[PDB]
Design an enzyme around this catalytic site. Structure first.
Site, short mmCIF file in Angstrom:
data_model
loop_
_atom_site.label_atom_id
_atom_site.label_comp_id
_atom_site.label_asym_id
_atom_site.label_seq_id
_atom_site.Cartn_x
_atom_site.Cartn_y
_atom_site.Cartn_z
N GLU A 35 0.95 -1.09 0.15
CA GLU A 35 0.50 0.04 -0.40
C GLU A 35 1.30 1.66 0.18
OE1 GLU A 35 -2.55 1.09 -1.58
OE2 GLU A 35 -3.77 -0.63 0.26
N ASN A 46 -5.90 10.21 -6.71
CA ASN A 46 -6.70 9.35 -8.04
C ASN A 46 -7.57 10.50 -8.82
OD1 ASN A 46 -6.96 8.86 -4.78
ND2 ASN A 46 -6.33 6.78 -6.29
N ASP A 48 -10.81 11.81 -8.80
CA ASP A 48 -11.64 12.15 -8.35
C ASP A 48 -11.86 13.63 -7.23
OD1 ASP A 48 -10.95 10.79 -6.30
OD2 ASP A 48 -13.13 10.86 -5.97
N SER A 50 -9.88 13.84 -4.71
CA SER A 50 -9.74 13.13 -3.67
C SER A 50 -7.98 12.01 -3.55
CB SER A 50 -10.14 11.49 -3.49
OG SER A 50 -9.01 10.19 -3.61
N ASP A 52 -4.55 10.15 -1.75
CA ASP A 52 -4.29 9.06 -0.70
C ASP A 52 -3.01 9.28 -0.08
OD1 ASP A 52 -6.89 8.03 -1.83
OD2 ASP A 52 -5.54 5.85 -2.23
N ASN A 59 -7.84 7.49 2.29
CA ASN A 59 -8.70 8.47 1.54
C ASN A 59 -9.62 10.05 2.08
OD1 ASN A 59 -10.74 9.13 -0.43
ND2 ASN A 59 -9.43 8.50 -1.63
#
Length: 129
Positions: A35, A46, A48, A50, A52, A59
């Protein structure tokens, strides 16, 4: 900071994650590896808005506020950035509410595809825990 396999194993334990919601410690070390690569600073966008953040790549549309992801409800009520510090309290602490909402560690694309149903124990073999 970028954690050692063994080392992060220990850390996460100190903090209550071993068999948290019945997920073995290995599940957690394996998940963070693939991860975030033992790297707590790591960040990832990512498409949209958003993003991480940190070791467990939590998120921002749901878990932590980062000031630029509009769809945001701050369920973890911590600012994303806090998740990047060399102290995984926040993450682990927040990670615990993601594991318990309802989809287990399935909520983590990675553990699922690459950890789920492998002998995760080998991640913590050699560790003094």
């Amino acid at each position: 900071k970028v954690f050692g396999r063994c080392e992060l194993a220990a850390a996460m334990k100190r903090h209550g994650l071993d068999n948290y919601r019945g997920y073995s410690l290995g599940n957690w070390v394996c998940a963070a590896k693939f991860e975030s690569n033992f790297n707590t600073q790591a960040t990832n966008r990512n498409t949209d808005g958003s993003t991480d953040y940190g070791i467990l790549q939590i998120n921002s549309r749901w878990w932590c506020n980062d000031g630029r992801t509009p769809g945001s409800r701050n369920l973890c009520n911590i600012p994303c950035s806090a998740l990047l510090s060399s102290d995984i309290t926040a993450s682990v602490n927040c990670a615990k509410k993601i594991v318990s909402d309802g989809n287990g560690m399935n909520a983590w694309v990675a553990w699922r595809n690459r950890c789920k149903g492998t002998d995760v124990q080998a991640w913590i073999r050699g560790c003094r825990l």
